[PDB]
């Protein structure tokens, strides 16, 4: 049941991974609202470069659109379209 070295080595290297991201951190100026769900699943660059001079970053991105409920306390709740950026490709490059 032991994960072999080259398999961990290849699986953890910098690449797009489904990451749950808070909606409010992605749309900072919407402070009068609560969102449901409060976070969404998005492909984002992750992992290690295995070299302290490099860092994992997006090289290609694209939008995804989802129906999110927007709540304004004491004055209305509406399900609408919200768009987030996803990372289609990543690379390790200098810092």
Minimum CB separation from its own copies for residue 75, in Å?
19
Region at 47 (left for phi over 0; alpha for psi -120 to 50; beta for the rest): left
**In angstroms, rounded to a whole number, what is the distance separating the alpha carbons of residues 76 and 72?**
6
Q: Which is nearer to its own copies, 7 or 60 (CB)?
A: 7
The residue among 38 and 88 lying less far from its own copies, judged by its C-beta, is 38
Nearer residue to its own copies within complex by CB, 9 or 60: 9
Gap between the Cα atoms of 9 and 34, Å rounded: 40
Q: How far is the CB of 10 from its own copies (least distance, A)?
A: 9
Cα 13 to Cα 42: distance, rounded to the nearest angstrom:
18
Which letter does DSSP use for residue 30 in this model?
A: -
List residues near its own copies by CB under 8 A. 1-5, 8-9, 11-13, 17-18, 20, 22, 36-41, 46-50, 64-69, 79, 81
Q: Cβ of residue 1: shortest distance to its own copies, in angstroms?
A: 7
């Amino acid at each position: 049941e032991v994960v072999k070295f080259m398999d961990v080595y290849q699986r953890s290297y910098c690449h797009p991974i489904e990451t749950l991201v808070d909606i409010f951190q992605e749309y900072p100026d919407e402070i009068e609202y609560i969102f449901k769900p409060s976070c969404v699943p998005l492909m984002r660059c992750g992992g290690c470069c295995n070299d302290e001079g490099l860092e994992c970053v997006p090289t290609e991105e694209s939008n995804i659109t989802m129906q999110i409920m927007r709540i304004k306390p004491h004055q209305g709740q509406h399900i609408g379209e919200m768009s987030f950026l996803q990372h289609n490709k990543c690379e390790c490059r200098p810092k």
